[PDB]
């Protein structure tokens, strides 16, 4: 209400000719009375008769050039009587009731358009009700630092640090709806144009036929139809959640950068494509320009690739909530703060780096190790794989905690999700009894590079043993093992 009453009190208008002619009216119609008050200043020269009279006189430049003290009067106190006593004077006092009446008629008219002017202000009462229905960041912009323009609102990132261009800024339109400013991310009431993160996974098989690749993409579309109703901050709360998602895509920009540390696709410095060798497949995308920008026809068919692909997005998304979390571990925990993000691209690399690694590496390599263990497929034998390497390090949701009760909780939260981030290959073993021998091997991913380090002991009355830590040598070691096994 106050703002709107202040708006009407800002003279403000965007009128062409309408606004123009009106102000010209003020100029001339005001000027007239200004000029006639100057006849009033000429009665001043009319005194003459005194030095202080001359002072008043010089009021006209023409008085400056019309030297005389000029005029003189006599006595008609009788004429004062006539002015007062005339039947005309009694009658003239009727001109007093008459003008005063028409002034009261004006007054009535003005008064009524006033309540109807308060009625356009009831549109605002409703807007405030709309705001009542449905961050208290306080800001000032347009520089100056004092006065200028000052207001308040919330934003997105908070605990843990992406770094650049991150926040939110919020103001109310005359349509009783709130416009969401961003202090960049440029305003468009509950946004203008939005990019969700998106994803997309291709597989190029053809049964190894013509190098035909198709994709499939796990799609995140709540709808294209948008509501976020005017006068409703509750709908704006929904728009604020949308804002959070937009801030999240900025996180996928960090993952883009974290790609830059790998040899899997980044082409021209203008687009980067996520992709991996086996069965040639591709998984997800978003150009070094951006992520997911909305404009397409909509039909529903799915596809096996598509179902898998929705699993990727949530993981990749999830994985950097981890980053968003182990950042805050350090922050909450120790003095300096965390600021400046992923040195050694050790912290960075986690996002999109360890998922790629995980899928591809351990798995393909394990498969390949298994064919090599088919080179030990020869003896009747037996051989088994566990999470045993996984069990031995990196336990999940443990009661132990860390330094503190407050600290302990967050540490624990990290740990169970930490399985996913840690995802090196577990490793395996094989054994024989009858005067008994034994051997064993561990597959280690170090960033999608694969080590296979093995062990072996033949337990008997007197002990003999060897342990060794490349796949070429592993093949050969297996051949040497056949000879020193039973055969």
């Amino acid at each position: 209400n106050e703002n709107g009453e202040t708006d009407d009190n800002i003279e403000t208008v965007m009128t062409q000719e309408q606004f123009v002619k009106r102000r010209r009216d003020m100029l001339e119609h005001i000027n007239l009375a200004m000029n006639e008050s100057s006849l009033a200043l000429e009665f001043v020269s009319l005194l003459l008769s005194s030095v202080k009279e001359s002072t008043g006189m010089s009021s006209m430049s023409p008085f400056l050039r019309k030297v005389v003290k000029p005029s003189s009067l006599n006595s008609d106190k009788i004429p004062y009587v006539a002015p007062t006593k005339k039947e005309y004077i009694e009658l003239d006092i009727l001109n007093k009731g008459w003008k005063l009446q028409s002034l009261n008629e004006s007054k009535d008219l003005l008064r009524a358009s006033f309540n109807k002017l308060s009625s356009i202000l009831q549109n605002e009462h409703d807007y405030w009700n709309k705001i009542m229905q449905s961050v208290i960041f306080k800001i000032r912009d347009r520089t100056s630092g004092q006065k200028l323009l000052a207001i308040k609102y919330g934003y997105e990132d908070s605990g843990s640090t992406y770094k650049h261009d991150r926040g939110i800024a919020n103001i109310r339109n005359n349509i009783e709806s709130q416009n969401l400013d961003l202090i960049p991310h440029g305003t468009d009431f509950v946004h203008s144009v939005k990019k969700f993160l998106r994803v997309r996974i291709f597989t190029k098989i053809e049964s190894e036929d013509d190098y035909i690749l198709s994709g499939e993409s796990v799609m995140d579309r709540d709808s294209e139809s948008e509501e976020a109703e005017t006068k409703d901050i509750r709908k704006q709360i929904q728009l604020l959640k949308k804002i959070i998602f937009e801030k999240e895509l900025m996180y996928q920009i960090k993952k883009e950068c974290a790609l830059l540390i790998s040899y899997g696709v980044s082409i021209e410095n203008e687009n980067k494509v996520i992709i991996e060798l086996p069965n040639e497949k591709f998984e997800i995308e978003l150009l070094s320009l951006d992520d997911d920008s909305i404009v397409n026809h909509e039909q529903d068919l799915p596809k096996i690739n598509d179902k898998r692909a929705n699993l990727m997005l949530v993981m990749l998304r999830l994985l950097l909530v981890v980053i968003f979390k182990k950042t805050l571990r350090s922050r909450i925990s120790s003095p300096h703060g965390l600021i400046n993000l992923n040195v050694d691209d050790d912290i960075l690399i986690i996002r999109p780096i360890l998922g790629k690694v995980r899928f591809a590496n351990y798995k393909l390599l394990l498969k390949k190790i298994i064919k090599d263990y088919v080179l030990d497929i020869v003896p009747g034998s037996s051989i088994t794989e566990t999470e045993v390497e996984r069990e031995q390090p990196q336990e999940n949701k443990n009661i132990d905690d860390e330094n503190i009760t407050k600290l302990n909780k967050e540490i624990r939260a990290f740990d169970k999700l930490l399985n996913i981030p840690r995802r090196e290959l577990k490793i395996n073993l094989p054994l024989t009894e009858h005067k008994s021998p034994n051997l064993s091997l561990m597959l280690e991913s170090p960033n999608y590079c694969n080590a296979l380090i093995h062990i072996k002991f033949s337990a008997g009355t007197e002990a003999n043993a060897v342990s060794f830590d490349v796949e070429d040598f592993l093949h050969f070691i297996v051949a040497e093992y056949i000879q020193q096994k039973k055969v």
């Binding site: 209400n1 009261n104 308060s118 009542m132 919330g154 990132d157 605990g159």
Partner: protein, 103 residues
């Protein structure tokens, strides 16, 4: 929040003030008829008249009272980081659950 009540009490006091105007506007046009000698609605003139006085006295007590209340409320006693940090998981985790089995 429950202050939205106190907010609506004042927004209504606002409508009371726009009535101080609406009412005294009649007082303007009605005293127009009255000094015009046509004693026609002299009782009705008195009515809407003590009514403009009444509306503004009610507004006067109501916003004066509201100011007293705000002083009383005053006498009475980043958020971003908190909920958001954790909640990350809650949405992505619940959604990862959703794509794994459903319906």
């Amino acid at each position: 929040p429950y202050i939205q009540e106190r907010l609506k009490s004042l927004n209504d006091i606002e409508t009371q003030l726009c009535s101080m105007l609406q009412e005294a506007s009649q007082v303007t046009f009605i005293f127009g008829e009255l000094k015009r000698g046509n004693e026609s609605v002299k009782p009705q003139f008195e009515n809407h008249v003590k009514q403009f006085y009444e509306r503004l006295d009610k507004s006067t007590t109501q916003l004066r009272k509201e100011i007293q209340l705000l002083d009383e409320n005053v006498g009475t006693r980043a958020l971003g980081q908190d909920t958001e940090k954790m909640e990350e998981q809650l949405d992505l985790l619940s959604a990862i659950l959703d794509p794994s089995k459903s319906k």
